[PDB]
Design a protein around this ligand. Structure first.
Ligand SMILES: Ic1ccccc1-c1nn[nH]n1
Ligand SMILES: [Zn+2]
Length: 212
C-alpha cells in the first residue's frame, strides 16, 4: 500500500548545533536547521507544524495510508534538514510532505507550495511538480488563499531548499501561511484551523497518490 513521509518542519527544541553546515544537494552548504518563526502571540512554528502534522497523520491513517514522521516529539532536538531528506529516501515513500509556516510582512497572507527546480532527477522533474500543483489546488479548495506576497499563484519552484534538492521520491514543502498575519495566525492558533489545514493536505496527498 501507500506510504507517506511527513516532516513537521523545525525542531521541538534547538541548541547551538543547528548552526552546523550540512550539504544543500547542489554543492554548497546551509545551516542544519533554522529555528523557525512564531505568531505575534508567541505560538511557535515548530508547534504549529507538529500539531498540524499529527492531524495530517490521523487523516492519512484513516485512509489506510501508512505514515512516518521526521521527528517523534515537539520538545527536543530533531534531525537536521539533510538527515530528514536521507531518512525519507531510505523509506522509499510514495510521497514526502514537509510542513512549514512563514514569517513575512503582516499584510501578506496565504500559502505557497515549494518544489525543487531546476530538477536534479526525473522524479523532481515530473511527479513532484504534479504533486505541487495538485496540492496548490487543494489548499485553494479549502479556502486557504494563495500567498499574495511570495511565489506565483501558490507555487514556488526553487533551488535553495536542501530537503527538496536531496529528495529521490515525490516531495514538496508547504508553507501554509504567514504567522505574522492576523488571519493566518488565527487559523494556525486554533485546533479547528489546524484541522482545516490537515484536511487540505490529506486531499492533496491522496489526489497525487491516486494518479500514480
Ligand atoms: I527535510 C524536507 C522534506 C521535504 C521537502 C522539503 C524539505 C526541506 N527542505 N529544506 N528544509 N526542509
Ligand atoms: Zn519553516
Amino acid at each position: 500500500g501507500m506510504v507517506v513521509f511527513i516532516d513537521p518542519g523545525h525542531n521541538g527544541a534547538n541548541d547551538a548545533s543547528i548552526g552546523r553546515q550540512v550539504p544543500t544537494g547542489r554543492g554548497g552548504t546551509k545551516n542544519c536547521q533554522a529555528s523557525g518563526t512564531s505568531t505575534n502571540s508567541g505560538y511557535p512554528e515548530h508547534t504549529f507544524t507538529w500539531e498540524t502534522g499529527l492531524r495530517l497523520r490521523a487523516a492519512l491513517n484513516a485512509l489506510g495510508v501508512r505514515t512516518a514522521l521526521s521527528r517523534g516529539n515537539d520538545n527536543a532536538l530533531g534531525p537536521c534538514v539533510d538527515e530528514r531528506a536521507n531518512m525519507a529516501n531510505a523509506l522509499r515513500p510514495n510521497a514526502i510532505v514537509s510542513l512549514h509556516a512563514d514569517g513575512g510582512p503582516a499584510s501578506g497572507r496565504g500559502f505557497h507550495v515549494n518544489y525543487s527546480a531546476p530538477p536534479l532527477n526525473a522524479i523532481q522533474a515530473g511527479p513532484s511538480v504534479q504533486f505541487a500543483r495538485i496540492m496548490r489546488d487543494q489548499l485553494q479548495a479549502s479556502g486557504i488563499p494563495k500567498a499574495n506576497y511570495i511565489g506565483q499563484d501558490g507555487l514556488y519552484g526553487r533551488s535553495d531548499l536542501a530537503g527538496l534538492n536531496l529528495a529521490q521520491y515525490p516531495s514538496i514543502l508547504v508553507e501554509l501561511g504567514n504567522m505574522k498575519n492576523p488571519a493566518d495566525s488565527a487559523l494556525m492558533e486554533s485546533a479547528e484551523g489546524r484541522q482545516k489545514y490537515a484536511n487540505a493536505l490529506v486531499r492533496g496527498v491522496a489526489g497525487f497518490l491516486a494518479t500514480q
